[PDB]
Design an enzyme around this catalytic site. Structure first.
Site: not given
Ligand SMILES: Nc1ncnc2c1ncn2[C@@H]1O[C@H](COP(=O)(O)OP(=O)(O)NP(=O)(O)O)[C@@H](O)[C@H]1O
Ligand SMILES: C[C@@H]1CN(c2ccc(Cl)nn2)CCN1C(=O)Cc1ccc(C2CC2)cc1
Ligand SMILES: [Mg+2]
Ligand SMILES: Nc1ncnc2c1ncn2[C@@H]1O[C@H](COP(=O)(O)OP(=O)(O)NP(=O)(O)O)[C@@H](O)[C@H]1O
Ligand SMILES: C[C@@H]1CN(c2ccc(Cl)nn2)CCN1C(=O)Cc1ccc(C2CC2)cc1
Ligand SMILES: [Mg+2]
Lengths: 356, 356
Positions: B125, B179, B182, B194
C-alpha cells in the site's frame, strides 16, 4: 513566615510545605499565634475544606532544608478553588514570601496580592520542574529510590515495578503530562530546553471522558477505563489487513485508527461507556508515548521520565507507556517514573526562597 | 480485460480505471459484450449504485498509458459496500487481472477470488502510493500543476492556493491521512521508509464527531465544524497563563489542552455540537501537523506533502496545516497538497499491471 512552594497549574494547585521539627523553646515564644495556627492546621488535617488533600504517603521526613530539619509535605487542590484558598489566606488570625510557578502564578498574581504584605515571586514552570525533580531524587524518598521503571514490561507475568538509579541523570527527556504535555531535554543542571509539547494531555482524557461517558471525576474515569475494552471503539491493524502488516512490522493488535470503529452506527450503539473511557485513555497515552519516542530519538536521549498528575493512581497508563516505549523502540528506550511526579514544580519553587 | 487499479482501505475503496479512446474498428469486433457493457456503465454514470462516485473533475484526459491513449478515471466507494461490488462483478454478462493494494487486498483476497478466472495481484500500500504520486505529478493534471501550497499562510488576507513544482521531488515527507496516518520519507524512486505513523487520523475525526455530535456523514461533520468555535472546548495557553507563555515562545492562542475546558460541567452544558466538531477537527489536524514537523526535522526534509481522503473537500484542515507548519517551523517547512490526494495507491496498483 511559613515556607511554601506553589505550582498553580491549569487544573491543579500543588503546594509543598516544609514543617520545621527542630523548633526550640525560645523560638516558640518569638512566633505569632497565626504562624502556630497554620502549622497546626496543616499537620493535624489530611483533608482541607472539601477539595484539599495532603498526600501523606509522599511526605519526606527529617529533611534538612535551609539549615533546618523538618518534614516536607505535599498538598493539592483544584485551581478552580484557589479563590477559597486566597480568602482563607486573607482571614484574620493569618496576618510571607510565596514562591509560585505554573501559569497561574501570572494569571492570579493580582489575586495573591490581595493578601496584605505578602510578597509573591514568580518562577518559571519548567525551570522549577527541573530543579525540583533533581532535588527530590538527590535526597531520596526516605531512603528508597525516587525513580522506578517496570522491568520486563514486554512480559506481563514478569512485569514488576523496580527501583531505578538516577545518580548521574544526564541527559534526560522529561515528559510532563498535566492538562497538556511539555517535553523537555535536560542536558545538565543549567542546560535544558522545551523540545516540544502536545495538547493531547490529561485534560483531553478527562474532558473527552466526561463528554463520552458522563463521568464526574478523574478517578471515576480511570475506574470506568479499567473495566472497558478499547478495541470495541478502536480500529486495529487486523481490522484493515486481516492480520499483521508484515512489510512494515506492524502487529495486528496495533491501533490503526483510534475511535475508528465509531464511524459505524451499529458499533456506536453497542459500545459501552467503559469501552469509550478505555479507548480515550489508550488513545491519549499511546500518542504521548509516540511523541516522547520521536523526541528521544531526535535528541539522542535513551532515558524518558514521565511526570505530572495524569499518571497519579493511574497504573494502566504507566504500564501502557512502559510496554509501548520498550516495544516500539525495540528495547532502546526505557520508561521511567517518579514517586513525587505531580509535585516537582512546587518543590522547585520552594527551593527558590533563598534568592529573596 | 479492463485496466483497473484498486486500493481497498479501511474506510474507502479507491479505483482507477483507464478508458481507451483509440479503439479501432477491428478492435471493437474482437471485444466481448461484457467488456463493452462495463466500459459503457462506467463512462455513462457518475453515481454507481447508492454509494459509488466518479470524481469527474479529477479525470486525466488523453493520457498515453501502456502505449494506448485514453482517459484515467477516479472512482470511490465505501469498503463496507465491497460485497455489493464483488456481487456485481460475479453477475452474468460480466464474464481480468486486478492489481489491488491497501489492507483489503489481503483481508478480502478470498472474496475477490469468488469471481471466476479473475487474477488478483496484491501490491504493497505504500509502494503503490509512492509510484502513483510520482506518476501523476510527472504527467501533470491536464497541464496544470498536480501539487500546490498556500502562499503567505501566515496572513489570511493574502493566503491563496498556488501551484508548486515537484520536478525534482526528492527528498520528500509524505503524510498519508486515511483512517490512521502513515508518514513516509522518500529519498529516491526506489528508496523510501515508513518513518512512523499515528492512530489519530481521519477515522478518529469521523468516529469522535459521530459520538459527540450525532453527525451521519464526513461532509456533515465538516459543515458542523465550519460553524463552530473550537476554543469553547479547548483550553488555551491564555486560559492557563492569562496571556502568552513568553519564555518558551508559546502564543496565548495556542491550544494548551484539547477538550481541556470540558472538564467543567458548566462548559459541557454550554458547548454546541458545532463547537465540538470543530474542536475534534482542530485537535486531529494539529496533532498530525505536529507529528509531521517532528519527522521532517528528524529526517532533514523540508517538503511535507499531505495526502489521503481526510483532506478531500476539507479546506479547513488544509489551511490549518499550512498555517501551523509555517508558524511552528518559523518558515523552515512548507505544507504541500496534491489534487489527486486520495487516489495515489490505486494509480500505483494500476501501474503494476505490466508485471503480469
Ligand atoms: N465519503 C467519505 N466517507 C468516509 N470518509 C470520508 C469520506 N470523504 C472523506 N473521508 C475521510 O477520509 C478518511 C479515509 O481516507 P482514506 O485515504 O481513503 O483512508 P483508507 O485508505 O480508507 N484507510 P487506511 O486503511 O488507513 O489507508 C475517512 O477517515 C474520513 O476522515
Ligand atoms: C507504529 C506507530 C507508532 N505507534 C506508537 C505507539 C506508542 C509508542 Cl511509544 N510509539 N509508537 C502508534 C501506532 N503507530 C502506527 O503507525 C499506527 C498505524 C498503523 C497502521 C496504519 C495504516 C493501516 C496502514 C496507520 C496507523
Ligand atoms: Mg489508505
Ligand atoms: N484529582 C484530580 N483532579 C483533576 N485532574 C486530576 C486529578 N488527579 C489526577 N488528575 C489528572 O492530572 C491532570 C492534571 O495534571 P497536573 O500535572 O497537575 O497539570 P496542571 O499543572 O494542573 N496543568 P498545566 O498548566 O498544563 O501544567 C488532569 O488533567 C487529570 O488528567
Ligand atoms: C508548540 C507545541 C506543538 N504544537 C504544534 C502544532 C502544529 C504544528 Cl505543525 N507543530 N506544533 C501543538 C501545541 N504545542 C504545545 O506545546 C501545546 C502546549 C502548550 C502549553 C502547554 C502547557 C501550559 C504550559 C502544554 C501544551
Ligand atoms: Mg503543571
Amino acid at each position: 513566615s511559613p515556607w511554601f512552594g506553589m505550582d498553580i497549574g491549569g487544573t491543579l494547585v500543588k503546594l509543598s510545605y516544609f514543617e520545621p521539627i527542630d523548633i526550640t523553646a525560645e523560638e516558640e515564644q518569638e512566633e505569632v499565634e497565626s504562624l502556630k495556627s497554620i502549622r497546626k492546621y496543616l499537620t493535624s488535617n489530611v483533608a482541607y475544606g472539601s477539595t484539599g488533600i495532603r498526600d501523606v504517603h509522599l511526605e519526606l521526613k527529617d529533611l534538612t532544608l535551609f539549615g533546618r530539619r523538618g518534614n516536607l509535605h505535599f498538598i493539592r487542590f483544584p485551581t478552580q478553588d484557589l479563590p477559597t484558598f486566597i480568602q482563607m489566606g486573607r482571614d484574620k488570625n493569618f496576618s510571607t514570601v510565596l514562591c509560585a510557578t505554573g501559569g497561574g502564578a501570572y494569571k492570579f498574581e493580582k489575586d495573591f496580592r490581595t493578601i496584605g504584605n505578602l510578597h509573591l515571586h514568580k518562577l518559571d514552570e519548567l525551570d522549577c520542574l527541573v530543579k525540583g525533580l533533581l532535588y527530590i531524587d538527590s535526597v531520596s524518598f526516605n531512603g528508597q529510590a525516587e525513580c522506578y521503571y517496570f522491568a520486563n514490561a514486554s512480559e506481563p507475568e514478569r512485569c514488576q515495578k523496580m527501583p531505578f538509579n538516577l545518580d548521574d541523570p544526564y541527559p534526560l527527556l522529561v515528559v510532563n503530562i498535566g492538562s497538556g504535555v511539555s517535553i523537555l531535554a535536560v542536558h545538565s543542571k543549567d542546560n535544558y530546553k522545551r523540545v516540544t509539547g502536545t495538547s493531547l494531555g490529561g485534560g483531553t482524557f478527562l474532558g473527552l471522558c466526561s463528554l463520552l461517558t458522563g463521568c464526574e471525576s478523574f478517578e471515576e474515569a480511570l475506574e470506568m477505563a479499567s473495566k472497558g475494552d478499547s478495541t470495541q471503539a478502536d480500529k486495529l491493524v487486523r481490522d484493515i489487513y486481516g492480520g499483521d502488516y508484515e512489510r512494515f512490522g506492524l502487529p495486528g493488535w496495533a491501533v490503526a485508527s483510534s475511535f475508528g470503529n465509531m464511524i459505524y452506527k451499529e458499533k456506536r450503539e453497542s459500545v459501552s461507556k467503559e469501552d469509550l473511557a478505555r479507548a480515550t485513555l489508550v488513545t491519549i497515552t499511546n500518542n504521548i508515548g509516540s511523541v516522547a519516542r520521536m523526541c528521544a530519538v531526535n535528541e539522542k536521549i535513551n532515558r524518558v521520565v514521565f511526570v505530572g498528575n495524569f499518571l497519579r493512581v493511574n497504573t494502566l497508563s504507566m504500564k501502557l507507556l512502559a510496554y509501548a516505549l520498550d516495544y516500539w523502540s525495540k528495547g532502546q528506550l526505557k520508561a521511567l517514573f517518579l514517586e513525587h511526579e505531580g509535585y516537582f514544580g512546587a518543590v522547585g519553587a520552594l527551593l527558590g526562597l533563598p534568592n529573596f
